[PDB]
Design an enzyme around this catalytic site. Structure first.
Site, mmCIF file in Angstrom:
data_model
loop_
_atom_site.group_PDB
_atom_site.id
_atom_site.type_symbol
_atom_site.label_atom_id
_atom_site.label_comp_id
_atom_site.label_asym_id
_atom_site.label_seq_id
_atom_site.Cartn_x
_atom_site.Cartn_y
_atom_site.Cartn_z
ATOM 1 N N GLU A 24 -10.740 1.604 -9.150
ATOM 2 C CA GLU A 24 -10.137 0.393 -9.680
ATOM 3 C C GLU A 24 -9.618 0.633 -11.094
ATOM 4 O O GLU A 24 -8.539 0.161 -11.445
ATOM 5 C CB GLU A 24 -11.140 -0.765 -9.635
ATOM 6 C CG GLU A 24 -11.430 -1.214 -8.209
ATOM 7 C CD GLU A 24 -12.609 -2.160 -8.095
ATOM 8 O OE1 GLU A 24 -13.081 -2.665 -9.138
ATOM 9 O OE2 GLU A 24 -13.067 -2.395 -6.955
ATOM 10 N N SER B 76 0.846 -1.179 0.000
ATOM 11 C CA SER B 76 0.000 0.000 0.000
ATOM 12 C C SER B 76 0.891 1.242 0.000
ATOM 13 O O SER B 76 1.748 1.389 -0.869
ATOM 14 C CB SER B 76 -0.951 -0.042 1.207
ATOM 15 O OG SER B 76 -1.857 1.045 1.225
ATOM 16 N N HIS C 72 -6.094 -6.726 -2.501
ATOM 17 C CA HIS C 72 -5.298 -5.732 -1.785
ATOM 18 C C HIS C 72 -5.495 -5.936 -0.289
ATOM 19 O O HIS C 72 -6.233 -5.183 0.348
ATOM 20 C CB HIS C 72 -5.709 -4.300 -2.166
ATOM 21 C CG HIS C 72 -5.630 -3.993 -3.634
ATOM 22 N ND1 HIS C 72 -4.436 -3.898 -4.315
ATOM 23 C CD2 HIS C 72 -6.600 -3.720 -4.543
ATOM 24 C CE1 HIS C 72 -4.670 -3.588 -5.578
ATOM 25 N NE2 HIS C 72 -5.978 -3.479 -5.743
#
Length: 273
Positions: free
Chosen positions: A219, A119, A251
């Site tokens: 996305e 991330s 994720h």
């Protein structure tokens, strides 16, 4: 497991940084945390069996603790509204202060290591390798922001940082026009990754992103940026990358762990081969 919890002074930040540590070799995997990094434990230890998985790998494992929304970078100034009373200097800590301490006290090599981020810190890992290739011949980005200076990303990153502890992106890299945004943009720094022959491992997940805008729009942005990064790496002469985009990948900590396990042999062969 002989896991240790260390107090490593940071002169640049005027405080002690907690570091979770497991020995096992002179070279190390630096496991960087996500956006909501806590001050008690690194997210890899909270959510995954990373230490056990790398036990007796021939590699040490370093999990720095803290730095919520920091992007593991050196900030221009303290974050103002949330009352931060010092300036984040996490690049200085990771590249100077912490390796000096680990070398002096434990014999961990300051060079020849791997930076692995997810991330928030996926991009951090690539940037650390771009500017400090001797320290990091290996970098992995798991669901990272690969083009933070472009298009929607400065706005979205600012919103995410504010949602994670009230941190202000302007205090970090200035307005999006400031040179710090491109300096710290993995896409922009691909020529450094290529020149350094950095071994890069880039994981792209699908589905729910890791703002008040629709998930499908996010996305789409993510998909396009990831494809552009991969294409640009190849077009700029990159030849030392692994690009993983499995359809079922998410994720999330379970898949970030899957990738951490999958890359172990890769890291061993690059760092210890």
């Amino acid at each position: 497991l002989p896991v240790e919890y260390l107090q490593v002074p940071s002169a640049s930040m005027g405080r002690d940084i907690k570091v979770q540590f497991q020995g096992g070799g002179p070279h190390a995997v630096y496991l960087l945390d996500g956006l909501r990094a806590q001050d008690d434990y690194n997210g890899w230890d909270i959510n995954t069996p990373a230490f056990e998985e790398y036990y007796q790998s021939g590699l040490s494992v370093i999990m720095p603790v803290g730095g919520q929304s920091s992007f593991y970078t050196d900030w221009y100034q303290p974050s103002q509204s949330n009352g931060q009373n010092y300036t984040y200097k996490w690049e200085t800590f990771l590249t100077r202060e912490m390796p000096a301490w680990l070398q002096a006290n434990k014999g961990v090599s300051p060079t020849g290591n791997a930076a692995v981020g997810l991330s928030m810190s996926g991009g951090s890992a690539l940037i650390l390798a771009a500017y400090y290739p001797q320290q990091f011949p290996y970098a992995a980005s798991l669901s990272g922001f690969l083009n933070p200076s472009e298009g929607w990303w400065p706005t979205l990153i600012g919103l995410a940082m504010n949602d994670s502890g009230g941190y202000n992106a302007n205090s970090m890299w200035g307005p999006s026009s400031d040179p710090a945004w491109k300096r710290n943009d993995p896409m922009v720094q691909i020529p450094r990754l290529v020149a350094n022959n950095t071994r890069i491992w880039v994981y792209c997940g699908n589905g729910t992103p890791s703002d008040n805008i629709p998930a499908k729009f996010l996305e789409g942005l993510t998909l396009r940026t990831n494809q552009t990064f991969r294409d640009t790496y190849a077009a700029d002469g990159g030849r030392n990358g692994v690009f993983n985009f499995p359809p079922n990948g998410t994720h999330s900590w379970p898949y970030w762990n899957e990738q951490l396990v999958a890359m172990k042999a890769d890291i061993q062969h690059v760092l210890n081969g």
